[PDB]
Design an enzyme around this catalytic site. Structure first.
Site, short mmCIF file in Angstrom:
data_model
loop_
_atom_site.label_atom_id
_atom_site.label_comp_id
_atom_site.label_asym_id
_atom_site.label_seq_id
_atom_site.Cartn_x
_atom_site.Cartn_y
_atom_site.Cartn_z
N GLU A 79 -9.78 -13.32 -2.35
CA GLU A 79 -8.96 -13.70 -1.21
C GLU A 79 -9.67 -14.84 -0.52
O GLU A 79 -10.88 -14.74 -0.22
CB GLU A 79 -8.81 -12.53 -0.22
N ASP A 98 -7.09 -14.01 8.73
CA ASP A 98 -5.81 -13.90 7.99
C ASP A 98 -4.77 -14.89 8.51
O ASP A 98 -3.62 -14.48 8.75
CB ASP A 98 -5.21 -12.50 8.09
N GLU A 107 -10.87 -6.27 -5.31
CA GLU A 107 -10.83 -7.24 -4.24
C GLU A 107 -12.17 -7.22 -3.46
O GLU A 107 -12.49 -6.22 -2.77
CB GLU A 107 -9.69 -6.94 -3.31
N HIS A 143 0.89 -1.18 0.00
CA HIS A 143 0.00 0.00 0.00
C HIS A 143 0.91 1.21 0.00
O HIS A 143 1.96 1.19 0.66
CB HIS A 143 -0.86 0.14 1.27
N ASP A 158 -1.66 -12.88 1.63
CA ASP A 158 -2.20 -11.75 2.42
C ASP A 158 -2.67 -12.33 3.79
O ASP A 158 -3.80 -12.74 3.95
CB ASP A 158 -3.33 -11.08 1.65
N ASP A 201 2.24 1.86 3.43
CA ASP A 201 3.18 0.88 4.01
C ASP A 201 4.61 1.35 3.68
O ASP A 201 5.55 1.11 4.43
CB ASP A 201 3.04 -0.53 3.36
N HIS A 261 -11.89 -14.06 2.47
CA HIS A 261 -13.05 -13.17 2.25
C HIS A 261 -14.20 -13.92 1.75
O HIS A 261 -15.36 -13.72 2.22
CB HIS A 261 -12.70 -12.06 1.23
N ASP A 320 -12.38 -11.74 10.04
CA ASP A 320 -11.33 -12.03 9.05
C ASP A 320 -10.06 -12.39 9.84
O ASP A 320 -9.48 -11.57 10.49
CB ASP A 320 -11.21 -10.75 8.20
N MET A 356 2.88 -5.88 -7.79
CA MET A 356 1.53 -5.37 -7.47
C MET A 356 1.64 -4.28 -6.41
O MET A 356 2.48 -4.37 -5.47
CB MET A 356 0.68 -6.50 -6.92
N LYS A 408 -14.99 -8.28 -0.52
CA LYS A 408 -15.06 -8.73 0.89
C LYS A 408 -16.48 -8.46 1.34
O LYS A 408 -17.06 -7.45 1.01
CB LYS A 408 -14.06 -7.97 1.76
N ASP A 440 -5.22 -13.66 -3.54
CA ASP A 440 -4.67 -13.49 -2.18
C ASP A 440 -4.89 -14.77 -1.42
O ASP A 440 -6.06 -15.20 -1.20
CB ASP A 440 -5.39 -12.33 -1.42
MG MG Z 1 -6.32 -9.04 0.52
#
Ligand code: MG
Ligand code: MG
Ligand code: MG
Ligand code: MG
Lengths: 384, 384, 384, 384
Positions: free
Chosen positions: B215, B255, B179, B52, B285, B55, B218, B253, B86, B181, B243
């Site tokens: 993802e 992860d 993406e 991002h 991810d 980030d 998700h 979520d 990406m 979700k 993802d």
């Molecule tokens: Mg993701």
């Protein structure tokens, strides 16, 4: 809150006619003659009835039996003034469809599914139906190796394309509405949500002939927001039919009467249908609970229509309230409706108020006032 | 099961760099310099990293600070041979985005979201990224009156259309991957599933520039079958990124590292990606659990790649087993791949073997042999 | 529907004081001084406030800082007439509790958790609280090997037993209420539902000192019927506190204002609390959405109380309606309340009307009339 | 991985004998004679079979028919060496039970339910069963007014108390195991989880006669961690039977073969049963999918046992691995098993290392090493 046939409330034969057999239980009610359901529904103020081929004509019927069943049904419709806006095929009950109809691994079953459907499209047109629903409830799998989903989607496209070619070839005025469901009776069902079905339709040879038939409970079985899905369908211009019922969360498909289940979602649904001016019938696909006798059956159906009408009144009062109109402006719903950049890309790139001089902290400090708005909506729903 | 950069495993900076703050908890780890994550990931055998904007460059950075951050990052990439396939924009963390970025009710926020994104597309191209992900995690609502979803979809289309016009206008070789979700952090998120996102994309001015970035977790948060959704994306030709992570059912979520969560679904996913010859990177991810120190962080990332590689071996052995190839024919997976009616509509309508002479009971009596097939798949997964 | 302190509505400091940080987002509101929340809540007609140790006294505070914070808080309570019926300890936020407090694998952390709690029990008693809540939100696991649940339950019993010994040893008039949650922030939380917590309590050395603190949203996150769970708690005599809020199904813990979420379940909850004569405070554990500014914060809290009061009126009108009383008899709710076999076992075994002469078909043909009853309840809720 | 009757694998008659009727579908298989299922299961290496009264004796049977059915069944058991460890009553299929058996609103139905059950307890004892299961699958409601849950729990206690008095009065050596399920076929079922059932049992007149019969899929239908629930049952000393099967998340009750569904949870379950030395039979309550013919039926049952045996081997290798034993110490699982304060309350209160001198930051910085441990568990499961 008395319905009249002007309200365009419709019911499936298989709704009030559900005998009450479930996975753990025998029937609690005897079978209803479709004639008696037509009469009873008309007396309650329904506008019409819908059917699966096998709800109206027993599977395996002779030509002569088939003709009699239809005759009697047409006489009840003529006696009551009830319409048949929609029909559909049963591709799920008979054991032959245990792995699918249009996406059965056995090619011979796929061909039979098409022919059974085409036979019923001719009947539907004969009765005046302008919408034909397809619910591929057996299309799917319990295990990962049993179905290659890319091959299955190829088969599903080919089936829907063949149907489109048929109706075009006959000059029939009928459109199709694909009904998504995420699971049950298969472990996972193909085209599980409104979105998957909308996307699928854009790959068909004649996409204008196909829309979706979203059902309240099916979307809620995936924990999705049914009003949001309906808004996407409307935005796409693909809401060709709708199925109304209740569902309490993510569990087996309950088919409660409309209004039971998620009451606030039922409010926001009616708000949306009415504000968008949806012109299709308000179709109920529900099951009177097996605890009920026939008196409870007709009370359940009446309750579907009553609840719609109460919610219609409450949503109309909400949008018409000057204090709600003010809250909607305080929450910038009017600004959501304006174009982001009607000035164009280059003007957006050259606008320092969009970046270099944008005060992010002052923007961030502005409250949305959504709780005030939502409490007004709750006060209207409850008539407080 | 040792990864090499040839395996094309990629990680977000925000994955290994997650400090461990959750809704009920403070950070358990200090912040990682993106330089150190590049080095550590390269040592584990990763191919690349993603980011991002925020980030890599602290929000509010001067031109000169921004230049330094990027310089140092480029030096780590040059020192290691790591790629950046990406990038994506943070339109969710800062309070200004509390009601959305592209579909914020405040128009000024929508314009700022576009400009923040466009600035980062230029950076992405500079670093060699060919895919740009958009995750509209704030696009949605907790209440029904706060967002008119039809107006929001208009705003979302306009934003994606403007981005498409930008990249076209610059001659950039980059595509977008939306993406989906279903919820979290909003009560319900717009484009909640792969299907809703595929359907949305077909309404954009230049649909060829946009795909989906599904993802694992998700889709599983809606109780959907992630392999099925990926197959629909592949069928559509719209799988532009993926993802990978783990999720234990319908809840917040999680992860988890890829391979944890729904292990059999992770097997059928790898089976599908490998059998379809998906050519994108295998992007993770995930979040190392807040219980872990940095040693556990690197073990978690290594475990993502290891699990992929074990599953790749098991799926390859499954498809290559003559006994599985025989079971697949016993279950008529070869027949699912054949056209239903290459002979045409009229020939299907004239074929008595499809209806009048179709023996439905003999068809119905044929078992699918799916349990034998699935037990072979389980034996392969487990190496039994 | 104006609340007065006679209605015994209470709020946590951490509710209205929630700054709006979520897993994907920074704070959208500044921190509130507990003094200002006391004043604001009192003005809205609240009766009292509750607290975690760390909501009132910053973690790491000196004796002298701790004394000042408490002094100021006591002055606001004295200025307003607000009560503190309940307190609780924060065993979840600080990184030291990342694997638990009472069931942390590290024994030293378990001992520290006990001491932190005991320090706060002394404070609670000083402020007049008669209920002490324990929410073991970190007690649990993301993976199967990380926690042996039998050893953890031993540790949890030992902790609760030690607390019981402490309060007994001090002669304090305080009872404990264990708050179940199925997940979040741990992958799975120990004592995930009201039932698991009731059963656990029956193994403690002094079970009379402990009850449950069920929260609407926590039960609904497992798809369970919150009124049913509350009825089991009441039946057991163990409903020692209750947390009221809203939740839309199985997803992350939303903490919406009471009345939002599952509206019909909120009706049946109020119906039950009022009909059972529950005497505890009506405690709201909710979060004003991060979209809101402080005006929206106070509107949200006011809406909790208003919705309770509307539902109380609608449930009271439902039970008082002669037509509902008749429907309740038609559905044999009066018969459900009679003993099945007050005559005794031998008389039941010798009663031929219970078996040999029981007409199962006539019994089976009797409809339950539940849809009529439920439509009356819906008409009352909606004021139709 | 070949089962032998020494492995104590048992199956219900209603499992392999399921004809394939579901809510949307007719039977796909003919009815099986219990004699043939006994023979087939014995050939596969099962140890025993279980039954509902109505699986073995058709409802409405004469004394003479009942005697013949039992005779033939006993002859198959004698011919094969198969045991009957458990029986249960069908209080769900017949329409008379549409609102419950023990908690039916109609008192006459409640008395009939008791008598039907008592008749079958005598049969069970005659066949050598030492466990009697009760699954109140009709006990519950679709709507809030239809069932007062406190009155229902009174009726449920009275029924279970009467049964206890009966078995005590006959000197029978049999115990009861209450089977929780959260929903389906009722909207919500009373005693929905293991926890609710454990807590209920502690209120019965003779709690030592009753335990729980948890089923993998039933707990997973609420999104709960089945191993955690089993650990609580074991901790309580109340695991009197167990039902093994597969389930893919929160949806209708799938009854997949054990090992399908949530594979990692199935690993941690076997790990727990084996490490606790559970001595009951490993009972499979599953349904071969309706897609299958009889060959697939027997393959499905064989797969239940095979998967158990593979998982038993993998869990045993995990606990026996020195590297896992070291990881378990690195994660302080040995410390979780030690008492928190065997020194006593006063010593804990006087220990400055528990509070004033506890270094919270050094404690907080210690990683748990749970990801390394979990990756070892995954490597063992997969045989990597
Ligand atoms: Mg993701
Ligand atoms: Mg439908
Ligand atoms: Mg709470
Ligand atoms: Mg069972």
């Amino acid at each position: 809150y008395q319905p009249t046939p002007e309200d365009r409330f419709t019911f499936g034969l298989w709704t009030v006619g559900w005998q009450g057999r479930d996975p753990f239980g025998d029937a609690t009610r005897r079978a209803l003659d479709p004639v008696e359901s037509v009469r009873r529904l008309a007396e309650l103020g329904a506008h019409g009835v819908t059917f699966h081929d096998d709800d109206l004509i027993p599977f395996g019927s002779s030509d002569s039996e088939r003709e009699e069943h239809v005759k009697r049904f047409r006489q009840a419709l003529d006696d009551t003034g009830m319409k048949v806006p929609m029909a559909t095929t049963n591709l799920f009950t008979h054991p032959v469809f245990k792995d699918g109809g249009f996406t059965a691994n056995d090619r011979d079953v796929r061909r039979y599914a098409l022919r059974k459907t085409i036979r019923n499209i001719d009947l539907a047109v004969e009765l005046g139906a302008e919408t034909y629903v397809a619910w591929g409830g057996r299309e799917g799998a319990e295990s990962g190796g049993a179905k290659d989903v890319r091959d299955a989607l190829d088969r599903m496209k080919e089936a829907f394309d063949l149907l489109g070619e048929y109706v075009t070839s006959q000059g029939y005025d009928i459109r199709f509405a694909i009904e998504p469901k995420p699971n049950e009776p298969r472990g996972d069902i193909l085209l599980p949500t409104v979105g998957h079905a909308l996307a699928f339709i854009e790959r068909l040879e004649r996409p204008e002939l196909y829309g979706v038939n979203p059902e309240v409970g099916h979307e809620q079985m995936a924990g999705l927001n049914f009003p949001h899905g309906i808004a996407q369908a409307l935005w796409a211009g693909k809401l060709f039919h709708i199925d109304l019922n209740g569902q309490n969360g993510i569990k087996y498909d309950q088919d409660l009467r409309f209004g039971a289940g998620d009451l606030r979602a039922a409010f926001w649904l009616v708000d949306l249908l009415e504000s968008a001016g949806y012109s299709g019938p308000r179709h109920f696909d529900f099951k009177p609970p097996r605890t009920e006798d026939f008196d409870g059956v007709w009370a359940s159906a009446a309750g579907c229509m009553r609840n719609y009408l109460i919610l219609k009144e409450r949503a109309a009062a909400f949008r018409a309230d000057p204090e709600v109109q003010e809250a909607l402006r305080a929450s910038r719903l009017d600004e959501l409706a304006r174009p982001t950049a009607a000035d164009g890309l280059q003007a957006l790139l050259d606008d320092r108020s969009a970046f270099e001089e944008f005060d992010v902290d002052a923007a961030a400090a502005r409250g949305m006032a959504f709780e005030r708005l939502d409490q007004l909506a709750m006060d209207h729903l409850l008539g407080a």
